[PDB]
Amino acid sequence: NKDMCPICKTDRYLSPDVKFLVNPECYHRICESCVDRIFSLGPAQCPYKGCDKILRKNKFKTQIFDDVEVEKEVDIRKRVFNVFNKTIDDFNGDLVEYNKYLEEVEDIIYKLDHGIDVAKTEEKLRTYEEL
C-alpha cells in the first residue's frame, strides 16, 4: 500500500516512523523499523510474499520517484552509465556514431529493465566494464 507497510502492518497515520526504504534488488514498501528488525542480524530473503531474493541491509536507500518502474529504470540507467560514458568528444565529433552508441546503450538499458535478454546483455556489460 502507498500509505501502509504490510511487513509490519502499520498505517502512516498512527505510526509515522514508516519510510520509503527501497531495495535496488527488488523494490518494496518496507519501512525502516522492519529493516532494523529483520536485516540487522544479517542478510535474508524478501519479506514480501511472492518474492524471496536475498538482500543486504547496507544496500538500502530511499526512492526519489513516485513510480517504482521509473525508479528501477533510473537505477539501471545509473548501473549502465557508470561504465558507458562515451561523449561527443570521445567520438571526435562523429554525430551519427554517437547516435548509434546512444541507441545501443538505451537498448541494453531497456533489455535490463524488461529482462528479455538479461543474460547476454549482462555478459556484454561485464566484458565492457573490464576494458
Binding site: 542480524l41 544479517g42 542478510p43 543486504r56
Partner: protein, 171 residues
C-alpha cells in the same frame, strides 16, 4: 583490538620484601600480575613496554596490615574487544552449541543461531565440525568472525561472535 595504553596499578608489597633492592621485587611482581592478566576495564594486558623506566610512586604503608601500597604507572599493550568488530582466528573447539575461535588470547564463542543455516553439526566425524555445501569449519581452521557482544567481568572477558554477515567465515 590491540592498543597501547598507560595503566596505573596498586601493588601491595609484603614487609618481607622491604630490602635494598625492593624496586626489582616491585617490578617483578608487576609483571606476574599484569603479563597475560585479563581486566574487564582495559582488556587482556599482554606485555609491559618501557620497562627501563617505570613510574613508581612512594608507597604508603597500610595502617593496619603493614604492607606498602604502591601506585605503579606503566605503559602496556592491551587487547580489548568491542562489539561490531571483525577479527580473524582459528577454531580451537567445536560442539553442538557452537565452536570457539581463538583470537589473540581470547576465545570467542560462535553460537549455533548465528551461522548460515547450511551449516549443521556432525559429531560422527572426528574431530566434530560443522559442514556446509561450500565450506567446512573444523579444528585449527582459519575463520573470520564479527564480534557482536562482549561481556567483561572484573577479571574475565567473554565475547559472542557471528559469521552470518557477508565476506566472513573461512578465508
Amino acid at each position: 583490538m590491540f592498543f597501547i595504553k598507560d595503566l596505573s596499578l596498586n601493588i601491595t608489597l609484603h614487609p618481607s620484601f622491604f630490602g635494598p633492592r625492593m624496586k626489582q621485587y616491585l617490578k617483578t611482581k608487576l609483571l606476574e600480575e599484569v603479563e597475560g592478566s585479563c581486566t574487564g576495564k582495559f582488556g587482556y594486558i599482554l606485555c609491559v613496554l618501557d620497562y627501563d623506566n617505570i613510574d613508581i610512586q612512594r608507597g604508603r604503608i597500610l595502617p593496619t596490615d603493614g604492607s606498602a601500597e604502591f601506585n605503579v604507572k606503566y605503559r602496556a599493550v592491551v587487547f580489548k574487544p568491542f562489539k561490531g568488530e571483525v577479527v580473524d582466528g582459528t577454531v580451537v573447539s567445536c560442539s553442538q552449541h557452537g565452536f570457539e575461535v581463538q583470537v589473540g588470547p581470547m576465545k570467542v564463542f560462535v553460537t549455533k543461531h548465528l551461522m548460515p543455516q547450511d551449516l549443521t553439526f556432525n559429531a560422527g566425524s572426528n574431530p566434530p565440525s560443522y559442514q556446509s555445501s561450500e565450506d567446512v569449519i573444523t579444528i585449527k581452521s582459519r575463520i573470520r568472525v564479527k564480534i557482536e557482544g562482549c561481556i567483561s567481568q572484573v577479571s574475565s572477558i567473554h565475547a559472542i561472535g557471528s559469521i552470518k554477515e557477508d565476506y566472513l567465515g573461512a578465508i
